[PDB]
Structure 1
């Protein structure tokens, strides 16, 4: 007779108190700049819904990044744009600088500030214990901000974090999966990269919230401190939950599904089984030990919970002892 509802613990009603225009993005009319202000220098990457390029703004000679959209429902384009406009100027959020359209193709393109990134496959190996703490704090600033502005990112993962290590500068990018949180709303669970999916997505619980992002942050942290990328390495969406169960154990999994009355896919019946909750030490070794501390593990344990209501908020995470060195240094 149905699954049990959930409300976010924090920033629950923030969009309700706003003018409709703020979250009702289908009514947003898009303000188009001049496509001839930007000349593409070279391709930077691909996506599911985009091709990305370095470009020059010829009026100021500023370097710029251009995300040319593949055909996607116009609703989804207005959402990314609206979300980006709402968040502009927020801490460690990428700045949307312009929106242009090819006058012939009619293909839309988003123009962003350039960050002098160093790709994470090279950067993460160089990273000290202190660096991980510093950049994790920087990410949490962005997440607390967007959550406080009524927005879930829903795609937090290393590819979506730009770090200019030289200037100790971080930007959270790709708001193309992001959505507005409204209490009661049932969301698409076919979101996020497999390795970063929260249990709520994996068991098809739709009434999820900001805390989804905190799970994915936990996945990031785990891979960085344990130097194991990715941390939960499922073969598919089913085996992804099993890879999690083999670590957080099945006891809390079934208490979770019980608490929310979740109709578990029949196909999980075979493969899930019974597994104990492991201790973090099973993942410590001499190569990664210098990154691992009791603080780090305490923090990680409080991100990585099945029950979304029981995970740390961004603000609570920022107040954790793991960050005391960082908070002191920022004053």
Structure 2
């Protein structure tokens, strides 16, 4: 039942894919992989095919490959990216070297929407509602996104949203340096390595995205890590004794204590004309102490989403076994586990 594969060179990369995928066209490249737009003749869908770059070159790369495949195979929610297909041209484990992942082709992202269109409060309500509905699902599987930003949120013509991770490069220090969107939505505990972070790092990002949908502007466009921290503390206030004790890094803790103390600002005076319910929700998401930050499940029940909230239609994920994360294996073992996952893949129904 193995399909027939055909080969083509696209931007000095050899692509070998089943015949069902036609009109391959390059849409992106990076350290982790290359992405092509294509037409799936079997389903009639416009798809995105990601060919992973050297997926088993090191233990780190082999584990990352296995990790992404496990995660994609698990995600089954209206607001989260789904795996349409996974394939390899390899006929056996011995010849296994390449992995291709297929998802829906995404049109616009949230950055394209905020660009020329000024969003109304009802539009903001619907977009944030869906992010939180998708996050509640991601978090219920004990998965932390870590990189929620407008470019990782796909929004169709009907304002239907999906959470994705379209990143193709290594999230290095250099990539996070300066006046960069890669760091503007990051929680201060992850950006400054304050302590062992939890999934509320993602709620900080939603708060940053919501503020930007409401004003059309970046909430914390820092020119560097320290300038961004100062922009944060000006709005939310400098931390109290309770939070400083939770900063496990003595160096980071010592730096914060050197700053002049500042009170939390009045958010109604920052977000002029915004719905007072939006302002209230923003104050619950943009909390410096991650332990006190509203969760996705708590946020869906907030009065700001009264028009969309349906507790009978906000599902949680099936149990997700990620015991593999603390497993020490050789490249060939991570490869064989990846291979079993490719061959056991069951496509979703129409």
- The alpha-carbon distance between structure 1 residues 249 and 45, as it changes in their structure 2 partners (threshold 3 A), is same
- Name the CA distance, whole Å, in 2 between partners of 1:146 and 1:266: 31
Residue by residue over 1:94-144, the C-alpha shift from the partner in whole angstroms, topping out at 9 and shown as x without a partner, is 1111223466994432110234x3343442224221011011111111111
Write the distance in 1 (CA, Å) between the matches of 2:258 and 2:62.
40
* Structure index of larger Rg: 2
1:141-195 Cα distance to aligned partner (Å, 9 max, x none): 11111111121111111111111133x4211111879xxxxxxxxxx99999311
What's the offset of the Cα at 1:204?
Answer: 1.4
Is residue 2:283 matched to residue 1:295? no
Unaligned ranges ≥5, structure 2: 1-15, 56-60, 314-350
Deviation at 1:271, TM superposition (A): 7.7
Question: Any idea what SS the aligned residue of 1:209 has?
Answer: coil
Please say if residues 49 and 103 of structure 2, whose CA atoms lie closer than 8 Å, have aligned partners that are also in contact: yes
Q: Tell me if the contact between 2:80 and 2:134 (Cα under 8 Å) persists in the aligned partners.
A: yes
Question: Which of 226, 249, 272 is residue 238 of structure 1 equivalent to?
Answer: 226
Please state whether the residue corresponding to 1:326 is helix, strand or coil: coil
Q: 1:175 to 1:100 in 2, by over 3 A?
A: same
Q: Deviations over 1:14-52 (max 9, x none)?
A: xxxxxxxxxxxxxxxxxxx95444235323334553332
Secondary structure (helix, strand or coil) at the match of 1:59 reads: coil
1:67 aligns with 2:59: no
Give the Cα separation in 1 of the matches to 2:31 and 2:284: 32
Q: Contact conserved, 1:40 with 1:53, CA < 8 A, in 2?
A: no
Alignment partner, residue 174 of structure 1:
165
Match of 1:280 among 262, 267, 272: 267
Query: What are the within-5 Å matches in structure 2 for residues 1-331 of structure 1?
Result: 35-47=18-30, 49-71=32-54, 73-87=61-75, 89-101=76-88, 106-115=97-106, 117-124=107-114, 125-166=117-158, 168-174=159-165, 193-228=182-217, 230-252=218-240, 255-265=242-252, 268=255, 272-285=259-272, 289=273, 292-327=274-309
TM-score, normalisation: structure 2: 0.70
Q: Conserved in 1, the CA contact under 8 Å of 2:195 and 2:248?
A: no
8 Å Cα contact 1:84-1:175 kept in structure 2: no
Question: Over the residues paired in the alignment, what is the CA RMSD in angstroms?
Answer: 3.3
Give the drift of 1:306.
1.1
Which whole-Å deviations, capped at 9, do the CAs of 1:262-306 have from their partners, x for residues lacking one?
423389469844333211244335xxx3xx111001000100111
Partner residue in 2 for 1:21: none
